[PDB]
């Protein structure tokens with residue numbers, strides 16, 4: 181099986197989290213392709229992948245805004261090949277904000293409309309993800325067991 185991880189990260193937190201998940205999946209036997217959202221195009225992005233994991237941090241002055249590099253992908257999600265695709269989401273944030281990891285919710289909701297199959301509720305990391313390593317590894321393991 182092939183898994184794609186696409187992340188939008190500005191300060192490196194969601195990127196670390198994506199790398200952590202990627203190693204877990206690889207150790208299990210998946211062929212993993214991990215890509216920064218800045219480097220991808222939406223159109224047919226998910227083609228060929230058995231599992232897609234999308235990660236993004238949350239921004240915005242007084243609204244929920246997705247990480248800049250992820251925005252174009254979210255805006256064109258309908259062209260990615262999400263129907264019937266097994267997906268799960270993750271993100272980093274900071275619980276000082278009420279809309280903690282709000283990006284994750286926005287992405288999940290769109291995916292559901294698009295007919296994707298959300299295999300596990302999104303992983304939401306507060307603060308330094310290295311401090312949450314066990315939680316990330318545990319979530320990767322739960323995603324695997326949910327396929």
Ligand SMILES: Cc1cc2nc3c(=O)[nH]c(=O)nc-3n(C[C@H](O)[C@H](O)[C@H](O)COP(=O)(O)O)c2cc1C
Nearest residue numbers: 189190191192193194237238239273274277280281
């Ligand atoms: C202006 C600003 C707005 C933010 N808004 C949110 C927010 O609504 N929800 C949240 O959970 N975190 C918010 N954050 C926290 C970032 O998402 C958090 O620093 C995160 O670790 C960045 O992840 P990244 O390094 O992968 O981009 C905000 C941070 C800044 C500076």
